[PDB]
């Protein structure tokens, strides 16, 4: 086996310009942990303080991007005041400051339950294997920990569209995020990450002080 | 049946289901002061009432709404204040709801009955029905008035195209600009309203609760506060 | 015929419609210093035409702009618009009040996309082709389009080209609700005033009313 089954974790490769962050806990179907939580967060912070890297990009070792947090080990490690990042991270769901100041492309795949949609929604570039399912089946439960949905998915989606999912928890498929805007590309199941690599290249390609300024712009645009 | 005189609204509660009816059909539904006040005051009594947990906006009759009555209603504003412990059903007004909201729509659709539309969380259509803002053809609109959500839904090109020409279009074109949810055969809209609805009274009250919340940040927040966000950034 | 030298605009009033023509087909309407300001005051021009009751934007030749004259409006930057001059990408004040139809052909680099996101309707001929230079020449965004572009496209998409710097043509524009119709080449003016034409008749009172209401919000 290379699948883990034990506490998550997130690999990372530096590729030229790119950094590519994985998550790896198959296992699991990449639930998140803390551990893996934290690990992400850290990585997220190597790839802002990286002079060298250009574009991140995340994926999901294994045949699921996430089956959503792991909160019977969660639960005991949160205080009343909430989850809190490591020191030197940067929240994957860009809700607390530091915020990320360069681009992000996603490759998602498999499975994409619950705080998933919300870490997708959080890049610049998403593609997903063809048959990916994503559900909100939190708001079945109650309010979660973290992860919960934003004003990302409205914005893209339209109000209407948006509310069909948020406020049912019913899936949808990649054809379906496509349609709403979630998602630039639906590619057949196994090219997502090197999809998403092509994508991540020619933003790398562009001029790094540019590509800055127009996050940054942007960023202000919905904020 | 139809009624001709002033406007009101049905009430009914249905398990978690809270039913708001228009009920003037013999005017079009076209909205008195007296028909405003009574559906702000059913979306207020939905939201205090704990056991409701998604509201359906419907009309009685053959048609949603004709708009404003303004032979009734515009020698009666500066301005419209709602009653009390009413929620303005436009959400442009504080209180906001803080409770999910399905409507459905057939027939004729005019001016502020878009508006009426937009304003809710899913949106169902009779094929056919006919929505126009024909506001432009005449004078600024006392209430109902255009908004920011037609832009954020339809995008601010094709919604300016029937904003400021009052042109016509029908449920099929008001799906392919994202204003419904869903485009159904005529009269199964309330059916299919009412299936959306129980679907999301399965949801957690809380959870749905937060998200709408969550959702209504910066919901109606115009373009030009965006662009001076960014002109400054430059 | 086809002007070489510094940019400028056209005017012609055609009854209620105030007619704008990038003048500057040479340079592929490339924006100097010179088209910005008479843009800008051309503009300013129709807010107080009270005669005019829709403007259209369009370009003389085949080329709906190359962008901003870098070279040139590098120094410029030591960006004033003219006293009684609307800023053309509605990004500083004042803001224009009156409704904006624009038309465009062939090549629309950069600042092109940026006027075209600025109006009430955008019509294309069909083969043009669009792209966000700036990333790739190591230049910020002019502004507006960071903002607009992720409103019509969503963000992934408008990310997907703003990016990149990678180029679209008129059918992926409108699916991304950049443009409100694609003609044939050669139709883009002509459909373009249809349209101007039918916002003309709308009472121009009420016309203003419901533009002020959809910039502002709530």
Not at 161 to 187: K, P, S
Request: overall charge negative; proline content about 5%; glycine content about 10%.
């Amino acid at each position: 086996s290379e699948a883990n089954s034990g506490p998550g974790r997130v690999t990372r490769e530096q590729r030229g310009h790119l950094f590519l962050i994985g998550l790896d806990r198959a296992g699991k179907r990449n639930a998140f942990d803390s551990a893996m939580l934290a690990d992400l967060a850290l990585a997220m912070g190597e790839y802002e303080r990286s002079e060298e890297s250009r574009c991140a990009v995340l994926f999901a070792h294994g045949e699921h991007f996430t089956a959503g947090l792991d909160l019977m080990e969660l639960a005991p490690k949160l205080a009343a005041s909430g989850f809190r990042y490591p020191d030197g991270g940067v929240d994957p769901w860009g809700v607390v400051q530091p915020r990320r100041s360069k681009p992000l492309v996603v490759a998602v795949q498999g499975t994409c339950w619950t705080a998933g949609i919300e870490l997708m929604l959080n890049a610049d570039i998403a593609v997903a294997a063809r048959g990916t399912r994503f559900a909100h089946l939190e708001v079945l439960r109650g309010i979660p920990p973290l992860g919960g949905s934003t004003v990302r998915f409205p914005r893209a989606a339209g109000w209407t569209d948006a509310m069909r999912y948020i406020l049912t928890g019913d899936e949808f498929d990649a054809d379906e995020a496509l349609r709403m805007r979630l998602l630039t590309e639906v590619v057949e199941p196994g090219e997502e990450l090197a999809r998403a690599l092509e994508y991540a290249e020619r933003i790398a390609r562009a001029a790094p002080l540019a590509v800055r300024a127009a996050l940054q712009s942007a960023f202000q645009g919905r904020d």
